[PDB]
Amino acid sequence: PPTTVKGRDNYDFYGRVDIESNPTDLNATNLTRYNYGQPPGTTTAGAVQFKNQVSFDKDFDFNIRVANNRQSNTTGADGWGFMFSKKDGDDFLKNGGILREKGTPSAAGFRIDTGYYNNDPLDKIQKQAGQGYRGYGTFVKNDSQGNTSKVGSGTPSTDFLNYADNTTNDLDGKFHGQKLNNVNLKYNASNQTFTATYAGKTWTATLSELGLSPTDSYNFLVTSSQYGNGNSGTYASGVMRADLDGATLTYT
Ligand SMILES: [Ca+2]
Ligand SMILES: [Mg+2]
Ligand SMILES: [Mg+2]
Ligand SMILES: [Mg+2]
Ligand code: NA
Ligand code: NA
Numbered sequence: 627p628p629t630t631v632k633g634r635d636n637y638d639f640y641g642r643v644d645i646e647s648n649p650t651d652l653n654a655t656n657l658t659r660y661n662y663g664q665p666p667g668t669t670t671a672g673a674v675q676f677k678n679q680v681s682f683d684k685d686f687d688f689n690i691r692v693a694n695n696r697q698s699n700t701t702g703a704d705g706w707g708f709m710f711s712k713k714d715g716d717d718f719l720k721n722g723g724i725l726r727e728k729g730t731p732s733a734a735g736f737r738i739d740t741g742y743y744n745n746d747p748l749d750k751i752q753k754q755a756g757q758g759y760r761g762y763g764t765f766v767k768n769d770s771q772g773n774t775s776k777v778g779s780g781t782p783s784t785d786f787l788n789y790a791d792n793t794t795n796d797l798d799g800k801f802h803g804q805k806l807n808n809v810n811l812k813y814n815a816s817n818q819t820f821t822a823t824y825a826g827k828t829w830t831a832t833l834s835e836l837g838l839s840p841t842d843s844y845n846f847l848v849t850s851s852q853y854g855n856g857n858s859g860t861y862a863s864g865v866m867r868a869d870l871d872g873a874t875l876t877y878t
Contacts, residue, residue: 628877628878629878631875634656634658634870634871636676636678637676637677637870639673640672640673640675640718641671641672642663642669643658643660644658645657645658645659646658652693652806653806654869657867657869657870658867658871659865661864664852666861667853669719670852670864671851672850672851673715673718673723673847674848675845675846676846676875679845680844680877681839682815682818682839682841683840684877685812685814685877686875687812687813687876688708688811688812688846689808689809689874690809690848690869690870690873691806691808691809691873692738692869693806693867693868694738694759694790695804695862695864697863698757698759700742700860702741702863703741703852703864703865703866704725704740704743704852705739705741705850706738706848706849707724707738707847707848707849707851708809708811708822708847709846709848709849710734710838710847711733712842712843713733713845724737724767725737725849726743726851726853727743727745727774731768731769731770731771731772732769732770733767734838736766736829737762737766738761738787740759740866741852748764748776752786758788760786760788761787762782762786762787764776764778764829765778765836767835767836767837769837777837778835778836787803787824787825790804801826807825809823818832818833820836
């Protein structure tokens with residue numbers, strides 16, 4: 627029978643990730659926080675890893691609220707990577723994830739991209755360069771050599787998202803990415819399909835498209851990073867936050 631799990635104790639912490647006990651700008655406590663107190667660079671990356679492994683002969687359902695930095699895509703973090711990998715968080719710190727052009731081989735998952743990188747071909751396809759808070763969502767996979775590619779549903783037009791805005795109101799019925807908002811990542815074993823929802827948008831990819839094994843065991847990691855884009859010294863805190871304590875994960 628499946629198990630549904632909630633609590634920080636179910637996750638190991640790797641890299642530049644900590645707990646912000648008493649946020650001043652969000653109605654929350656004990657948020658998991660990435661990229662804090664370190665400038666952009668190769669080691670500015672973090673992951674939480676669910677302590678038990680999952681496999682794609684059974685359903686999987688993960689829900690977590692995330693709040694993006696209210697920082698432009700040339701100053702803030704790279705985004706969020708909800709990643710399946712046969713390797714652990716230290717492998718992610720060494721070899722990268724799913725937020726750039728290359729990361730750890732044969733991983734895959736859902737990318738909420740909030741940071742522009744001049745050498746990322748997908749950022750060019752998605753028209754990420756520009757003013758405001760320009761980003762995108764999509765499933766991606768890393769091939770056996772680590773190269774990242776878009777897989778599954780979407781076009782540049784439909785993948786696009788404004789990952790934050792300059793407003794504060796909580797009354798307009800709209801998505802505001804700097805607030806806490808649910809990300810749902812679901813795997814339906816019956817139709818071998820992954821679904822991701824965020825910001826009122828949906829993405830779909832098959833198991834085949836993600837390239838993952840139908841039976842091998844996988845780790846699940848929630849990742850962020852702020853690896854840097856050049857040497858100008860232009861950056862902000864890159865602080866990305868998730869309510870890991872309030873997340874739910876259903877698996878078998
Ligand atoms: Ca990007
Ligand atoms: Mg608002
Ligand atoms: Mg958000
Ligand atoms: Mg399939
Ligand atoms: Na407002
Ligand atoms: Na930072």
